[PDB]
């Protein structure tokens, strides 16, 4: 369904946020 | 539908957050 | 509709978050 | 409606997050 | 209603995130 | 209800985010 | 249900965000 799929798109965008925060962690490590 | 499209706007806004966190990572790296 | 408009308000608020993160990045640059 | 008003409460809480991240930016600049 | 009440719980949890970011701001000031 | 319970799981996960941001604040404090 | 399951996917992605913030804290601790 379109609403469920749009909620999956939200979930995928929150995973992108997580990956961006991992880039911040890598920056402070290096 | 209107609700599904509004949820997709939420997803797009979260991608903007993800990009801004990549900007923070780049700023820490110099 | 009122639910779709409220979800658009959420999307606008998450763009405010993104912009605040960009301000953090510009603070770390300088 | 109750669901729309609750979604508005979520939007207002996301604006509070934005304002807090602005505080972080000011703290890094000070 | 239960859906509206659960959306209010999400808003309460977002305010906790805002508080935690004020803690990070305070930690950088010191 | 299953939708309300899933929204409560989102709220709990946002609390987890808040706790993790306090860990960042503690790290800056040390 | 599909919508409940998509909301659970959002909750899972927010826990990934929390983990990445723990990684940021760990990188600031050395």
Residue numbers in the entry:
A (entry chain F), B (entry chain E), C (entry chain D), D (entry chain C), E (entry chain B), F (entry chain A), ...: 1 to 30
What does the publication say?
The combination of a = Leu plus d = Ile consistently forms α-helical barrels. First, the Leu residues at a were replaced by 4,5-dehydroleucine to give CC-Type2-deLI. This unnatural amino acid is similarly hydrophobicity to Leu, but it has an sp2 hybridised Cγ. In solution, this peptide behaved as a folded, heptameric, α-helical barrel. Indeed, its X-ray crystal structure overlaid almost precisely with the parent peptide CC-Type2-LI.
CCs are quaternary structures comprising two or more α-helices supercoiled around each other with cyclic (Cn) or dihedral (Dn) symmetry. Here, we describe variants with all combinations of the aliphatic residues, Ile, Leu and Val, at a and d to give four classes of peptide: the ββ class, with a and d = Ile or Val; Lβ, a = Leu and d = Ile or Val; βL, a = Ile or Val and d = Leu; and LL, a = d = Leu. Peptides are named systematically appending the one-letter code for the amino acids at the a and d sites to “CC-Type2-“; e.g., CC-Hept becomes CC-Type2-LI. In summary, solution-phase data and X-ray crystal structures demonstrate conclusively that different classes of Type-2 coiled-coil (CC) peptides—i.e., based on abcdefg repeats with predominantly hydrophobic residues at a, d, e and g—adopt a range of distinct states.
